[PDB]
Amino acid sequence: SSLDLQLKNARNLAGLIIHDIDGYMMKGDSSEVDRFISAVKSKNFIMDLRVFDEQAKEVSPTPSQTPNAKIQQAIAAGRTLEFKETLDGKRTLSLVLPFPNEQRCQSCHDAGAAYLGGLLVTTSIE
Amino acid sequence: SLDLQLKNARNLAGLIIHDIDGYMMKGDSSEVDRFISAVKSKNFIMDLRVFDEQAKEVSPTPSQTPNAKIQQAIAAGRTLEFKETLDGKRTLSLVLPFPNEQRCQSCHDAGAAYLGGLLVTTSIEEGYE
Ligand code: HEM
Numbered sequence: 001s002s003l004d005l006q007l008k009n010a011r012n013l014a015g016l017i018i019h020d021i022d023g024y025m026m027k028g029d030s031s032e033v034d035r036f037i038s039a040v041k042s043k044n045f046i047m048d049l050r051v052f053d054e055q056a057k058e059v060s061p062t063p064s065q066t067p068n069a070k071i072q073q074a075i076a077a078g079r080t081l082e083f084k085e086t087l088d089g090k091r092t093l094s095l096v097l098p099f100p101n102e103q104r105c106q107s108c109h110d111a112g113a114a115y116l117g118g119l120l121v122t123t124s125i126e
Numbered sequence: 127s128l129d130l131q132l133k134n135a136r137n138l139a140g141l142i143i144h145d146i147d148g149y150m151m152k153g154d155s156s157e158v159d160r161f162i163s164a165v166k167s168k169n170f171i172m173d174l175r176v177f178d179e180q181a182k183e184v185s186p187t188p189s190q191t192p193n194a195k196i197q198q199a200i201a202a203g204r205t206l207e208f209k210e211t212l213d214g215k216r217t218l219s220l221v222l223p224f225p226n227e228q229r230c231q232s233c234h235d236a237g238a239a240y241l242g243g244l245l246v247t248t249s250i251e252e253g254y255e
């Protein structure tokens with residue numbers, strides 16, 4: 001179970017990476033390919049990653065009791081938001097999106113929720 | 127292009143949500159913090175290499191020596207995956223051929239079915255510890 005999950009996640013990661021690089025291949029510029037590879041392996045590929053509960057309050061990695069406005073909006077509107085920020089001197093893109101409350105989640109979650117929380121991920125675009 | 131970066135970022139977010147969905151349905155909600163550390167670590171993308179139609183690496187380390195795995199992926203037109211212990215961790219390396227899709231054909235003559243290959247290595251140690 002734990003291994004299958006790890007394997008599934010790994011295969012999806014590979015799918016993501018080739019789809020990502022396909023966009024760079026479309027440029028017909030080797031320079032762009034080299035830079036992408038360096039960027040995805042770097043520590044700034046995923047500079048931040050936080051998961052929030054339905055109340056827009058962070059749960060992982062650092063539990064908080066203060067709601068995150070962007071998450072609040074993403075959940076309320078049920079849409080993905082994105083905004084630029086300069087973090088530790090780097091230009092980045094942050095995405096905030098809600099977790100759809102699929103029927104299968106009802107076993108442990110409120111079946112009536114539209115969304116079960118949010119995710120915030122920040123990646124460098126330097 | 128910012129739009130390309132955004133599209134890619136969007137799919138990254140999608141992967142993460144799909145990954146966490148897995149931990150949840152498997153009853154492993156408590157492993158999310160560990161998942162996050164792993165995703166931000168240098169072990170997420172442990173290696174990434176691109177090869178041409180002759181299975182020779184073009185980036186980031188140009189080589190004239192063919193990669194047997196890539197070679198088979200391209201010749202067979204299929205994705206190969208193998209477990210390997212690297213950098214002190216149990217990992218999964220996936221070898222994928224680049225299909226010459228319609229959009230690609232605007233430059234690559236449709237004669238070739240695949241244009242090369244990609245190797246990606248990620249840690250799967252979390253699956254054991
Ligand atoms: C694909 C359906 C599901 C989705 C989208 C989902 C989503 C979420 C989200 C976004 C959170 C809040 C943030 C976090 O704790 O990291 C959460 C918390 C939680 N989920 Fe789920 N979940 C799903 C299925 C499940 C299932 C089936 C279980 C029961 C086996 C479960 C048990 C929990 C628990 C125990 C928490 C509390 C975690 C904590 O605060 O420490 N979830 N879930």
Ligand code: HEM
Nearest residue numbers: 022025026027028029030177178184224230232233241242
């Ligand atoms: C998603 C569709 C595409 C894929 C999958 C693709 C794949 C590849 C692969 C695997 C290589 C050899 C490895 C490498 O040099 O990195 C390559 C080289 C190349 N491709 Fe593409 N390609 C695509 C679209 C395009 C387009 C649309 C153009 C023209 C605008 C193009 C122009 C080139 C050029 C010029 C090279 C030679 C190396 C260089 O970039 O200087 N490719 N392509």
